[PDB]
């Protein structure tokens, strides 16, 4: 009479769990290397009626996996590549004076050196244009800025660094829960839950200050600061609309090739065709104003609505966070975005051209054990992108709930991964289970 507990199988159970993500893609590019398995055009989402699930942003380790997965790729792409250590020979230089726009003066140097031919016994004079950013004076003549740091390398310019979406799929017996709620706070339960066995691609693209090409917020601009009272935390900001940005590298770039050993081509910058001009970026002025108004409305959700909000010029620190940077067009750029923050907000022609800079020696991420040369790319660079959000920080020590101010900040790439990954969590399916029954086992 008394109930017997008995076996059932395949009953849904969720456990929070972590497994290694499986890479997949639509259909050489560094980001996919074409090694990711191609995947089916069948995003068969399953709405989960009557369920809710906790999701905690900044707790998911998919973010961490992505963060190190891309690093491993980056190194993998460079391990085949030729070392540039012959370039630590000191250089004679002059400031370039040929057709220089006045605000470009001293930006480039023409320099030369006694570096070796591919023959073991011979040397040749060599010269190239260089950005001033990539060199330091040998004494109060120049040397590459990284010769006192781990060695510079570069080869294999053919590989593309343009972003390609990357998809991640749960291992069999696991699934990816997602939250569709347009109002979702970075943490806690979500009523909108549905699931997929895999996810839509996410681009590897990075920025040091503003999110680029991210998914738009579903309803309204949103902010995810974690516990906002702690101002050491980065403030995520997600636009619910795109902001177009155009940029250029107006100089007509040309290329030179050098042999530094057998089989070892070395890229060098040819003289620019035409007048030298600064790299720049155009954004709508009006749109920038409008979207800031959307942002401050969001900020006020945590404050009295008559509070003062301010934006500011960057507080400095390392250039990689002091300025906005991107690899669009296959070449690195930096810009002075501080003009974008020259405003304050109170209760109650059509565009801007930001100045920019180019550095060819890239020290990736926070690492100091590696550096690489970026090859010149011939012609004018053009770039078009959608700005989809901001990485912001807030000054500590404010009082009387007013005059809060903000600056661009962060630059840990992990937060970029989070801007997309907050939508998902990985769970483990535990099909096994039991329940009481009126049944007792049959006689043998």
């Amino acid at each position, epitope marked *: 009479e008394n109930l017997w507990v008995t076996v059932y199988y395949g009953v849904p159970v969720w456990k929070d769990a972590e497994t290694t993500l499986f890479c997949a893609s639509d259909a050489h590019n560094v980001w996919a290397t074409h090694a990711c398995v191609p995947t089916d055009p069948n995003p068969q989402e399953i709405h*989960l009626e*009557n369920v809710t699930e906790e999701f905690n942003m900044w707790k998911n380790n998919m973010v961490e996996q992505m963060h190190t997965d891309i690093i491993s790729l980056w190194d993998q792409s460079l391990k085949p590549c030729v070392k540039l250590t012959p370039l630590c020979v000191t250089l004679q230089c002059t400031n370039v004076t040929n057709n220089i726009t006045d605000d470009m003066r001293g930006e480039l140097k023409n320099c030369s050196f006694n570096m070796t031919t591919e023959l073991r016994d011979k040397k040749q004079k060599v010269y190239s244009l260089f950005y001033r950013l990539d060199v330091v004076q040998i004494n109060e003549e120049y040397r590459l800025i990284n010769c006192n740091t781990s060695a510079i390398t570069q080869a294999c310019p053919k590989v593309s660094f343009e972003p390609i979406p990357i998809h991640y799929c749960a291992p069999a017996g696991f699934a990816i829960l997602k939250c569709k*709620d347009k109002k979702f706070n970075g943490t806690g339960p979500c*009523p*909108s839950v*549905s699931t997929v066995q895999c996810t839509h691609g996410i681009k590897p693209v990075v920025s040091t200050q503003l999110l680029l090409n991210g998914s738009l917020a579903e*309803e*309204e601009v949103m902010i995810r600061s974690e516990n906002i009272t702690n101002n050491a935390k980065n403030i995520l900001v997600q636009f619910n*609309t795109p902001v177009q940005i155009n940029c250029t590298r107006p100089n007509n770039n040309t290329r030179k090739s050098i042999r530094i050993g057998p089989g070892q081509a070395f890229y060098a910058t040819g003289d620019i065709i035409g007048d030298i001009r600064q790299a720049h970026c155009n954004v709508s002025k009006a749109t920038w104003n409008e979207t800031l108004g959307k942002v401050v409305k969001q900020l006020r959700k945590h404050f009295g609505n008559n509070t003062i909000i301010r934006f500011a010029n960057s507080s400095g620190g390392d250039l990689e966070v002091t300025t906005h940077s991107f690899n669009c067009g296959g070449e690195f750029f930096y810009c002075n975005t501080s003009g974008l923050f020259n405003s304050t907000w109170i209760s109650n022609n059509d565009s801007i051209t930001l100045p920019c800079r180019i550095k060819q020696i890239i020290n990736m991420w926070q690492r100091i054990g590696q550096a690489m040369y970026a090859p010149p790319i011939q012609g004018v660079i053009r770039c078009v992108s959608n700005i989809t959000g901001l990485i912001l920080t807030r000054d500590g020590g404010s009082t009387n709930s007013t005059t809060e101010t903000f600056r661009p900040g962060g630059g840990d790439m992990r937060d970029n991964w989070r801007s997309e990954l907050y939508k998902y969590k990985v769970v483990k399916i535990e099909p096994l289970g039991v329940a009481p029954t009126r049944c007792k086992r049959r006689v043998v």
Partner: antibody, heavy 115, light 114 residues
């Protein structure tokens, strides 16, 4: 809010209704929705649009035949095609926030589909 | 998607009585449920949003309760002005995660005995 565009139309016709805002605008973000009600029957949701980005949601019977659009800072439209007698109804537009019902409604415009 | 079932379809109450109107959701919508009053020939009027919050200018004899799957509109002390049809409305969408106001219940007619 005031709806406009209703009247008598023949089966098979297309029609566009407009919802016009006065005293406020889409400088603030809202869901603007269309709801209909046939004579003697209940309220039937058609569609909502989030005015910040024109993202739209549709009833299963409306998507593919009705289209909601934000056409200005004070107007939202409902384009209707392949109308039948069963589409005869008062059409209302309404304004809601996120999660907080619809506090503002128009008086409705009457669409009659008949031979 | 989610179906909203409203009961009873009609109800009679004496002036001064209490009347309770129920609305069932087939999937949980937590608290995202609104209630409307409609007089013949008028557009509907918001009474309650988020299951129990009173809208501006609505008499205190209206109240709402419930959460998840089951909700109740209570009129405590019915008046002749309350003779109307009442609708619940789902205010959350499980597929998209968004909180726009969408599908209605079938409606309940309240007749008032004076």
């Amino acid at each position: 809010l005031v709806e406009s565009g209703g009247g008598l139309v023949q089966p098979g016709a297309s029609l566009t209704l407009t919802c016009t805002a006065s005293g406020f605008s889409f400088s603030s973000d809202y869901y603007m929705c269309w709801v209909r009600q046939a004579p003697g029957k209940g309220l039937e949701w058609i569609a909502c649009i989030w005015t910040a980005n024109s993202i739209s949601y549709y009833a299963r019977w409306a998507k593919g035949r009705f289209t909601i659009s934000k056409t200005s800072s004070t107007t939202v439209t409902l384009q209707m095609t392949s109308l039948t007698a069963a589409d005869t109804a008062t059409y209302f537009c309404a304004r809601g926030g996120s999660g907080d019902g619809q506090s503002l409604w128009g008086p409705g415009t009457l669409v009659t589909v008949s031979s | 998607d989610i179906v909203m079932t409203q009961t009873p379809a009609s109800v009679e109450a004496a002036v001064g009585g209490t009347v309770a109107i129920k609305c069932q959701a087939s999937q949980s919508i937590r608290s995202y449920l609104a209630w409307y009053q409609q007089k013949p020939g008028q557009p509907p009027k918001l009474l309650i949003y988020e299951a129990s919050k009173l809208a501006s200018g609505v008499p205190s004899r209206f109240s709402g309760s419930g959460s998840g799957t089951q909700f109740t509109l209570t009129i405590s002390g019915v008046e002749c002005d309350d003779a109307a049809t009442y609708y619940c409305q789902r205010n959350y969408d499980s597929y998209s995660g968004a909180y726009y106001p969408n599908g209605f219940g079938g409606g309940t007619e309240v007749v008032v005995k004076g």
